[PDB]
Design a protein around this ligand. Structure first.
Ligand SMILES: Nc1ncnc2c1ncn2[C@@H]1O[C@H](COP(=O)(O)OP(=O)(O)CP(=O)(O)O)[C@@H](O)[C@H]1O
Ligand code: ALF
Ligand SMILES: [K+]
Ligand SMILES: [Mg+2]
Length: 994
């Protein structure tokens, strides 16, 4: 219940009315557990059902094609022709193709693993409370802890609830909140009020947050809030999102099924108009059932003529093709559609630490004293290469490589670094990589001493395992670490009391080695080491030292600095009280200053250039980090988001600063700003939202649990493979190899996928609004149905279905990444591109009804009926308007239908060559490009021939077309299609808008 880190220990103990040393009474626990319920996040239950599919039955590629499957199932129950056997295939292929596409929707969805469940792994099973019914501490179910009870935590513990700290039993309590701030560096807590009620977690140094863990120490607190009323609870709350995914491609293809569905219902009324003559002319009586059999035969034929049944499968294979192409860049795509959505992205938001940077604390600079006399102090300054905990990198003085052992200054530097140091480097043989044991900041020094190798030890021949701590080990064989004076908040340093290992001499080289806050340590330094020599700490020396420290702590190199000193004459081991850290500062006095070191969690090698390339492709990168504004900015300058001398005011905010802007100014601030620093998880998704509120496609890239809300908001969330599992779970792509330059590759991939999707979509629709043309002359002129649905499906699904996907193999438009992101308010079909495929679709429609009308009217071979009133075909019994009796029933012939269809296949093979481009003509551009499009055309017509000259088929379709007959003309009807789209192609490529 409590709403403050801003209250005092007392006011909080007060709020819930509880003794710090006795805890809660069973009475109170009863109440609280009643008022507040249990301490746990609910498990993303929002909505679900085996039923799922029950809702993927909305669009046209359902309802429209669902009638046509029942409307076509009733009609195929009254098929009292002589083909009662080949009857109800239509009902069953409409629904087998409907059950097919639908079941891919679900084996792709029954894959999701929830972030919320990934997130609840940060929930400790047990918690330790002090309650009233016992003197002893009580391990209880962490879910059975209520706001108010006294809680105890220690090293390794996961924090159970959100807790005000009451008492720190240790000399320092170090927490890891990378869960919330995305930095694993240990924050050092305290007890004092944090009075700002608008303080962010980074500020709330007296709180323990549920889900964080104790790096080190022991502490007593009072639970302040539990369950979903916690900071992690807020992360959980923005995970649950009933808001269904509306991908940028998918939506344009959902109101196209909406506008074509209105063309459907409304061209079934456009038939009621030319037909319906039977209320005025057909003498009131002519097989009355023939009306619902005709109106419904060509109703469920306009259904299937219009819809591209093949398209789902084609598309869902253009994606899978790219998904597997991305897989080979170690970009693991999780949601198929998202491979595209990356190309149209205009903004990329990015977590800093572990994403744009390696997240390996690196000492990149260090100095020692060089020369001192009078008013003059020169330093030796170095630089150290390496952005990783691996002992790979070299120490440079003036950009040229040196040996650190050539410098007595560095020998001591290194020593202090090895000994004043609780960390340790470990080579994980499984992951195949060096990892830290300990604080990142201390582990940085470990690695520095390895890299440095001041005793010039032979290390080349060493196993990686053994190379880990090699140089460190040398130094600690030299000096026995006697005991260690732990860091305290008072003195901002720590140190180590050390004895020599070798000397029987009666001369005690006994020594304390100190590191810490540079100001603090330099004050307690009376001397300054100059190699092997010791000289007094004058004021002009202290000034030179303190000056560079000011410089390295602030520039475009904004480093974490640390001073290193030794106490040459330490106290006597038995004069020192190691129980009371308040004493330790005084033992750490009379020091000889040794040198200084600067640290960075450095950028990944390839992040800078990826950023540069993103810029060229017209994409803007934004950093949104829970780390500090100075660090954030200096990384930005290094990866090129800012200029090395750019003045950044107004282009970088902290979470706090952002919050103080009026809501309007905030939304504008996301348009111009690039670092958002010291943010909370919810800042990241607020920002992604403002961005998207300008109808911009935004990606979020990161790796932390604090990244999750924004990984979700963003159109595309992209996780790093070394990141958290929840971040992986929340995103659609994981860069397995942490290669940040693969994101650029993924956008180029997205852009090419789109280009091709639209080129193969034009191809596929032209033969839909081109079969409907044919069903509307096969009906408006009372002609005999030139095509039946079973042929339509097969064609739309397969003959077209193949070269459709060979137009996914279409050569990637080069310079694809020299232009900007397409607009989302971009139309696919244009006022004139519609005029194109409507011009063509129109042609062929006639050309196939005009091959049903050349196996009669000019029927060179079989049953010809020249200029014959094919207004009727029921007329057969009464051969009076037309003589020719005993000829009856040639209208149901297989051959007139074989011609229409083979003309359709042949024209949808030349259309697949005009759709080998857009404006690019086959005149200038060789048709013989895609060896794959050729392969698909052969396979296409090689299957049409398996659909002619084979067993069981041709029976579901129609009788074989003979050479010298139904092919010469199937080919003579086809050719012109090229010329029609080659003149329409001139229209664009000689006098078009451009
Ligand atoms: N084990 C250790 N030995 C020596 N110095 C240490 C240390 N752990 C931390 N430091 C030093 O701690 C000094 C201050 O740490 P502290 O956590 O107390 O908070 P703070 O004063 O840095 C403010 P803030 O958290 O907002 O930046 C740092 O500059 C760091 O150099
Ligand atoms: F790694 Al972060 F904000 F969590 F940069
Ligand atoms: K997402
Ligand atoms: Mg991170």
């Amino acid at each position: 219940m409590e709403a403050a880190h801003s209250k005092s220990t007392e006011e909080c103990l007060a709020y819930f009315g509880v003794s710090e040393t006795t805890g809660l009474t069973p009475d109170q626990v009863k109440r609280h557990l009643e008022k507040y319920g249990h301490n746990e996040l609910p498990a993303e239950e929002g909505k679900s059902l085996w039923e799922l599919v029950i809702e993927q039955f909305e669009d046209l590629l359902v309802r429209i094609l669902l009638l046509a499957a029942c409307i076509s199932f009733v009609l195929a129950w009254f098929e009292e022709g002589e083909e009662t056997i080949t009857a109800f295939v239509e009902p069953f292929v409409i629904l087998l193709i409907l059950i097919a596409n639908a079941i891919v929707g679900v084996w792709q969805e029954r894959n999701a693993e929830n972030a919320i469940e990934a997130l609840k792994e940060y929930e400790p099973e047990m918690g330790k409370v002090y309650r009233a019914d016992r003197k002893s501490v009580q391990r209880i179910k962490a879910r059975d802890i209520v706001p108010g009870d006294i809680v105890e935590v220690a090293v390794g513990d996961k924090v159970p609830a959100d807790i005000r700290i009451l008492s720190i039993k240790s000399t320092t309590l170090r927490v890891d909140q990378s869960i919330l701030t995305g930095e694993s560096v240990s924050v050092i807590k305290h007890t004092e009020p944090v009075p700002d009620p608008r303080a962010v977690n980074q500020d709330k140094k007296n709180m323990l947050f549920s889900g964080t863990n104790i790096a080190a120490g022991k502490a007593l607190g009072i639970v302040a809030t539990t369950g979903v009323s916690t900071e992690i609870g807020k992360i959980r709350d923005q995970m649950a999102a009933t808001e269904q995914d509306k991908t940028p491609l998918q939506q344009k293809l959902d109101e196209f099924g909406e506008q074509l569905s209105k063309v459907i219902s409304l061209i079934c009324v456009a038939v009621w108009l030319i037909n319906i003559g039977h209320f005025n002319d057909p003498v009131h009586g002519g097989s009355w059932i023939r009306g619902a059999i005709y109106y419904f035969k060509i109703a469920v034929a306009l259904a299937v003529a219009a819809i591209p049944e093949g398209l789902p499968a084609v598309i869902t294979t253009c994606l899978a093709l790219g998904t597997r192409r991305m897989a080979k860049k170690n970009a693991i795509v999780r949601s198929l559609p998202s491979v595209e959505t990356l190309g149209c992205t205009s903004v990329i938001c990015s977590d800093k630490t572990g994403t744009l940077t390696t997240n390996q604390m690196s000492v990149c600079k260090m100095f020692i004293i060089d020369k001192v006399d009078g008013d003059f102090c020169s330093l030796n300054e170095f630089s150290i290469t390496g952005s990783t905990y691996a002992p790979e990198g070299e120490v440079l003085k003036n950009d040229k490589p040196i040996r650190s052992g050539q410098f007595d200054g560095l020998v001591e530097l290194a020593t202090i670094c090895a000994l004043c140091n609780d960390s340790s480097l470990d080579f994980n043989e499984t992951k195949g990589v060096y990892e830290k044991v300990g604080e990142a900041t201390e582990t940085a020094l470990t690695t520095l001493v390895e890299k440095m190798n001041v005793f010039n030890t032979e290390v080349r021949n060493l196993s990686k395992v053994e190379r880990a701590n090699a140089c460190n080990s040398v130094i600690r064989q030299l000096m026995k670490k006697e005991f260690t004076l732990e860091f305290s908040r008072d003195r901002k340093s720590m140190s180590v009391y050390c004895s020599p290992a070798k000397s029987s001499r009666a001369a005690v080289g006994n020594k304390m080695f100190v590191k810490g806050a540079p100001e603090g340590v330099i004050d307690r330094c009376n001397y300054v080491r100059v190699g092997t020599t010791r000289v007094p700490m004058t004021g002009p020396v202290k000034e030179k030292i303190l000056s560079v420290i000011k410089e390295w702590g602030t520039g475009r190199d904004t480093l974490r600095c640390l001073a290193l000193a030794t106490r040459d004459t330490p106290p006597k081991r038995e004069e020192m009280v190691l129980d009371d850290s308040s004493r330790f500062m005084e033992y750490e006095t009379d020091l000889t200053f040794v040198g200084v070191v600067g640290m960075l969690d450095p950028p990944r090698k390839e992040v800078m250039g990826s950023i540069q390339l993103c810029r060229d492709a017209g994409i803007r990168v934004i950093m949104i980090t829970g780390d500090n504004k100075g660090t954030a900015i200096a990384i930005c300058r290094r990866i090129g988001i800012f200029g090395e001398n750019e003045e950044v005011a107004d282009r970088a905010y902290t979470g706090r600063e952002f919050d103080d802007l009026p809501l309007a100014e905030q939304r504008e601030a996301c348009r111009r700003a690039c670092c958002f620093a010291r943010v909370e998880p919810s800042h990241k998704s607020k920002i992604v939202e403002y961005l998207q509120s300008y109808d911009e496609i935004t990606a979020m890239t990161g790796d932390g649990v604090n990244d999750a809300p924004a990984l979700k908001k963003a159109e595309i969330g992209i996780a790093m493979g070394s990141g958290t599992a929840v971040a992986k779970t929340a995103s659609e792509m994981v860069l397995a190899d942490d290669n940040f330059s693969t994101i650029v590759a993924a956008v180029e991939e997205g852009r090419a996928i789109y280009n091709n999707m639209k080129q193969f979509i034009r191809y596929l629709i032209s033969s839909n609004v081109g079969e409907v043309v044919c069903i509307f002359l096969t009906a408006a002129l009372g002609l005999p149905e030139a095509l039946i649905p079973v042929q339509l499906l097969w064609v739309n699904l397969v003959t077209d279905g193949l070269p459709a996907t060979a137009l996914g193999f279409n050569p990637p438009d080069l310079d694809i990444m020299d232009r900007p992101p397409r607009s989302p308010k971009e139309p696919l079909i244009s006022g004139w591109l519609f005029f194109r495929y409507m011009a063509i679709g129109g042609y062929v429609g006639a050309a196939t009804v005009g091959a049903a009308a050349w196996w009669f009217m000019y029927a060179e071979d079989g049953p010809g009926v020249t200029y014959h009133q094919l207004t009727h075909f029921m007329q057969c019994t009464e051969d009076h308007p037309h003589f020719e009796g005993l000829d009856c029933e040639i209208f149901e012939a297989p051959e007139p239908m074989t011609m229409a269809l083979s003309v359709l296949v042949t024209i949808e093979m030349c259309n697949a060559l005009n759709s080998l481009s857009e404006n690019q003509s086959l005149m200038r551009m060789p048709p013989w490009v895609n060896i794959w499009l050729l392969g698909s055309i052969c396979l296409s017509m090689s299957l049409h021939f398996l659909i002619l000259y084979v067993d069981p088929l041709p029976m579901i379709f129609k009788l074989k077309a003979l050479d010298l007959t139904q092919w010469l003309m199937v080919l003579k009807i086809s050719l012109p299609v090229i010329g029609l789209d080659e003149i329409l192609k001139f229209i664009a490529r000689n006098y078009l808008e451009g």
